[PDB]
Amino acid sequence: MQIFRDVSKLLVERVDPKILNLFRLLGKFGDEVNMPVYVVGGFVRDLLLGIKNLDIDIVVEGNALEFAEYAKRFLPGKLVKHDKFMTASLFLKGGLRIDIATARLDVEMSTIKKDLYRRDFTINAMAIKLNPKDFGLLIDFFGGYRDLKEGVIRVLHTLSFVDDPTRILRAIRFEQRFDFRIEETTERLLKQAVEEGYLERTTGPRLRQELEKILEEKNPLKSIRRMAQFDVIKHLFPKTYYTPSMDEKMENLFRNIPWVEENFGEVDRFYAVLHVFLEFYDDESWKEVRDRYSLRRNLINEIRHVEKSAPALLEMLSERVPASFVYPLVKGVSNETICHFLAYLSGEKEGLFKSYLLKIKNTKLEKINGEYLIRKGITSGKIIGEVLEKILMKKLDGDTRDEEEILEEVLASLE
Amino acid sequence: MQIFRDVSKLLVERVDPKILNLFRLLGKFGDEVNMPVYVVGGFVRDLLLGIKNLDIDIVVEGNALEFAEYAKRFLPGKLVKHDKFMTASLFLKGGLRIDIATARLEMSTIKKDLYRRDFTINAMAIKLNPKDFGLLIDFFGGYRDLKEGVIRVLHTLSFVDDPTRILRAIRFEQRFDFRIEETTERLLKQAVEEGYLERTTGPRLRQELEKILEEKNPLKSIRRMAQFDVIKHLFPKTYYTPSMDEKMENLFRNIPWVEENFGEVDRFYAVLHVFLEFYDDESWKEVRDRYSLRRNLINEIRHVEKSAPALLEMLSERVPASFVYPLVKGVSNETICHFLAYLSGEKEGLFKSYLLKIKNTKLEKINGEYLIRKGITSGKIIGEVLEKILMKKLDGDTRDEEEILEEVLASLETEGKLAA
Numbered sequence: 001m002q003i004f005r006d007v008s009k010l011l012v013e014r015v016d017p018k019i020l021n022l023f024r025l026l027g028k029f030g031d032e033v034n035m036p037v038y039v040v041g042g043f044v045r046d047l048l049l050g051i052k053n054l055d056i057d058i059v060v061e062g063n064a065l066e067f068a069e070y071a072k073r074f075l076p077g078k079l080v081k082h083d084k085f086m087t088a089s090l091f092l093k094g095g096l097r098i099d100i101a102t103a104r105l106d107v108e109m110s111t112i113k114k115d116l117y118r119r120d121f122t123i124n125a126m127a128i129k130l131n132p133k134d135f136g137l138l139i140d141f142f143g144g145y146r147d148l149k150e151g152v153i154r155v156l157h158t159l160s161f162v163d164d165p166t167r168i169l170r171a172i173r174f175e176q177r178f179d180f181r182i183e184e185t186t187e188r189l190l191k192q193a194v195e196e197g198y199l200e201r202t203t204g205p206r207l208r209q210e211l212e213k214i215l216e217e218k219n220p221l222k223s224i225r226r227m228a229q230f231d232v233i234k235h236l237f238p239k240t241y242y243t244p245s246m247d248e249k250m251e252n253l254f255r256n257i258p259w260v261e262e263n264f265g266e267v268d269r270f271y272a273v274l275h276v277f278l279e280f281y282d283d284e285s286w287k288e289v290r291d292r293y294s295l296r297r298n299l300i301n302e303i304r305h306v307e308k309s310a311p312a313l314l315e316m317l318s319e320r321v322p323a324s325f326v327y328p329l330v331k332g333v334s335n336e337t338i339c340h341f342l343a344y345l346s347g348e349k350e351g352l353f354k355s356y357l358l359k360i361k362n363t364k365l366e367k368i369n370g371e372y373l374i375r376k377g378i379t380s381g382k383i384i385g386e387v388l389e390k391i392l393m394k395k396l397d398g399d400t401r402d403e404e405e406i407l408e409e410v411l412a413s414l415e
Numbered sequence: 416m417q418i419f420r421d422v423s424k425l426l427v428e429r430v431d432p433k434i435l436n437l438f439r440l441l442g443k444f445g446d447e448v449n450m451p452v453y454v455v456g457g458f459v460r461d462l463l464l465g466i467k468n469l470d471i472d473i474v475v476e477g478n479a480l481e482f483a484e485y486a487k488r489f490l491p492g493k494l495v496k497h498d499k500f501m502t503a504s505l506f507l508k509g510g511l512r513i514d515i516a517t518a519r520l521e522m523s524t525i526k527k528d529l530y531r532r533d534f535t536i537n538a539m540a541i542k543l544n545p546k547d548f549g550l551l552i553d554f555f556g557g558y559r560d561l562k563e564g565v566i567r568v569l570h571t572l573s574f575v576d577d578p579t580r581i582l583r584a585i586r587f588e589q590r591f592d593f594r595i596e597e598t599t600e601r602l603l604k605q606a607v608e609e610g611y612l613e614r615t616t617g618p619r620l621r622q623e624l625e626k627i628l629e630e631k632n633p634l635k636s637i638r639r640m641a642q643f644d645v646i647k648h649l650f651p652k653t654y655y656t657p658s659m660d661e662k663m664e665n666l667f668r669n670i671p672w673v674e675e676n677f678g679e680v681d682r683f684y685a686v687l688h689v690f691l692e693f694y695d696d697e698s699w700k701e702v703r704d705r706y707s708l709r710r711n712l713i714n715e716i717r718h719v720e721k722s723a724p725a726l727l728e729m730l731s732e733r734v735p736a737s738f739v740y741p742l743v744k745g746v747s748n749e750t751i752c753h754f755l756a757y758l759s760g761e762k763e764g765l766f767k768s769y770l771l772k773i774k775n776t777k778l779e780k781i782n783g784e785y786l787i788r789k790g791i792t793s794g795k796i797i798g799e800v801l802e803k804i805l806m807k808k809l810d811g812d813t814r815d816e817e818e819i820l821e822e823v824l825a826s827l828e829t830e831g832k833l834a835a
């Protein structure tokens with residue numbers, strides 16, 4: 001196919017001038033220090049799709065470090081060097097990070113081709129040359145341009161997933177972000193690497209990251225679902241079986257995470273999802289998952305809390321009951337515990353349980369009473385904190401005045 | 416002779432990064448709109464000389480306006496377009512703006528554009544398009560002349576074409592401590608004698624002249640101008656004699672001092688004070704009209720040439736302060752210098768101390784006006800009696816009210832009512 005294309009006009013019309021100007025300069029600096037300068041990866045992809053990107057990757061043929069020190073000279077910002085693998089990032093204003101790398105060991109200067117070929121999918125393996133001579137040059141050896149037109153996710157070569165099974169995850173994320181489809185050959189390859197154990201063959205940490213990145217997408221459920229279609233989940237969490245049920249939970253989970261965030265703050269989605277994936281895990285199967293990925297040791301208790309009390313919750317919800325009855329179930333629990341509870345309901349029940357949650361957040365108001373009256377009268381320890389709890393509940397449902405309710409339960413519990 | 420050299424290394428080393436990046440961007444734009452882009456004029460001269468320069472003077476082979484318009488898409492600022500004659504200006508901050516013009520009518524049409532300029536060292540260019548980014552272009556041998564410090568017109572008619580360049584050539588001579596190579600010297604004299612300055616408008620000459628007086632040695636520029644007999648051809652009745660000269664010397668040694676105690680000094684006028692001395696009624700008319708001088712300047716100037724002798728015998732015999740006041744009472748700072756133009760040594764240290772006395776011994780402390788108005792009195796006598804007190808103060812004093820009474824008293828030679 002056409003391998004070279006002029007996207008210079010495309011550049012000036014779609015690229016904000018502060019940024020287009022930075023390209024013209026990087027290109028000239030490249031020429032001044034005698035190195036080919038390319039912008040590569042995601043920006044090239046998004047540019048052709050009309051998507052904005054402010055995370056731009058430069059590849060030079062030469063020395064990133066040199067090239068980047070030479071650039072700092074003429075550009076305002078902070079330079080971070082990473083010597084071990086000649087690489088660098090220049091930090092510019094307005095969320096704008098410019099990363100520079102050195103391409104390793106087809107006119108000739110086509111060593112970018114060896115750089116491009118090492119990448120994951122064709123839409124992500126294209127390059128735009130920035131040196132003034134060839135300023136707008138779209139370099140596309142692998143048919144990523146057409147693959148953008150035809151909405152196709154495609155690996156560069158047969159051994160792609162075997163080299164990095166982490167791309168199994170990447171393929172699905174991108175195919176779900178853009179509504180593309182993983183082409184036949186890649187799908188056979190993807191399926192095969194999953195089936196054979198390639199994921200189980202890759203480190204927890206890299207899997208976790210690729211997982212988190214999915215959870216930072218617009219619609220993670222899409223990807224989780226697609227994963228389930230490719231048996232990927234079974235192989236990440238060996239005791240998790242993604243059934244109509246789990247998936248119904250996952251949908252509720254995702255529906256309610258906003259509403260939670262809005263009222264309780266940051267939700268760590270990786271933990272929120274694990275609450276679902278991991279329900280009903282035996283003790284042993286839990287340690288292995290908790291060790292493969294690094295999972296806060298108390299998690300399995302928190303999950304076990306939700307999976308144990310869920311029918312009771314459901315039950316209380318039907319039969320609308322006194323808020324004080326559900327309090328013990330949401331006591332001092334993570335936003336993920338709350339999310340996990342919400343995973344279990346929809347419609348009327350859902351909102352109903354919402355209102356309880358609010359009633360609990362907001363009505364923690366013990367107000368006038370402040371623990372003084374308690375150790376003013378005689379008290380020690382645990383009793384202090386049990387009278388304080390009985391006062392608390394009485395409020396949630398109705399109310400008394402200041403402390404009739406206090407002497408109500410020191411003389412009701414006195415019995 | 417070598418025309419092309421590569422000053423790109425010198426560019427990154429000497430030019431400010433904001434500006435360099437401008438230069439690179441500008442070159443890059445030209446390539447995008449198919450126009451050769453050069454930086455020209457004095458920036459090139461100054462770069463080469465290590466002298467700071469912010470002027471961004473640009474010439475393109477294509478169309479200043481289309482170019483300037485294209486550049487504006489990517490550069491924040493006001494675009495003024497000098498639509499007649501195809502020039503533009505791109506306005507940016509820091510005191511910074513880009514002047515873009517069209518290389519008038521091989522890429523080496525810049526040669527024709529470089530050929531119209533004044534002197535070799537101002538006739539160069541640096542190309543900016545990325546393929547030739549730091550490329551010096553010296554068809555006319557401005558590098559050689561820059562290094563040898565030589566002022567040399569580009570061709571034979573240069574002075575006939577623009578007599579302004581005669582004053583320019585001197586100005587530069589003295590700014591860079593350069594000298595005017597002989598053929599340009601011979602060629603200038605010729606242009607001056609044949610009467611070419613007078614053939615070209617007053618403003619144009621006036622501007623070049625004010626410009627000369629802002630430079631490093633105005634004195635030097637003037638004695639030099641005198642050598643080529645240009646003064647005589649600018650102000651027909653000014654004859655640069657050693658009298659005329661020694662006045663000018665003092666003028667300039669004193670301006671610093673004047674400017675110190677009194678304030679800004681207009682050098683152009685401060686010079687004309689000396690040039691225009693002794694111009695008859697009919698001659699002042701012509702000069703004043705041509706260079707757009709103040710109707711009144713002649714008066715101020717005549718004032719000094721007349722009252723000048725009197726001042727000397729006032730300093731020999733250090734007569735009390737009062738006796739000189741009438742002579743410097745409302746006059747301009749230029750007038751003050753004009754007077755100072757006559758004094759050397761101990762005559763000036765004395766005359767200087769007098770001026771300083773009157774400056775801040777105005778000192779009308781409590782006897783201000785309507786005090787005297789509360790006795791009888793009405794206009795123009797008020798002013799006279801007030802003055803006579805202040806005047807007595809210049810040379811010692813009393814209460815400030817005892818003196819007014821000694822003076823109304825002295826009044827009775829006559830005023831108009833009262834006075835036991």
Ligand SMILES: Nc1ncnc2c1ncn2[C@@H]1O[C@H](COP(=O)(O)OP(=O)(O)OP(=O)(O)O)[C@@H](O)[C@H]1O
Nearest residue numbers: 040041042043118119120121124125164166167170
């Ligand atoms: N695991 C991988 N295998 C092969 N190539 C990769 C891999 N990760 C990244 N790349 C290459 O690095 C480029 C940038 O990495 P990055 O994760 O930022 O990709 P991206 O396209 O920006 O994805 P995102 O938009 O999710 O940030 C990609 O466009 C791709 O060429």
Ligand SMILES: Nc1ncnc2c1ncn2[C@@H]1O[C@H](COP(=O)(O)OP(=O)(O)OP(=O)(O)O)[C@@H](O)[C@H]1O
Nearest residue numbers: 456457458460470531532533537538577579580583
């Ligand atoms: N009177 C003139 N005749 C011919 N060419 C001129 C004349 N004045 C200027 N030029 C050309 O245009 C350029 C810009 O004019 P300008 O007076 O700003 O020069 P400059 O070198 O910047 O000197 P200055 O220090 O006075 O700014 C000159 O350097 C010269 O190349």
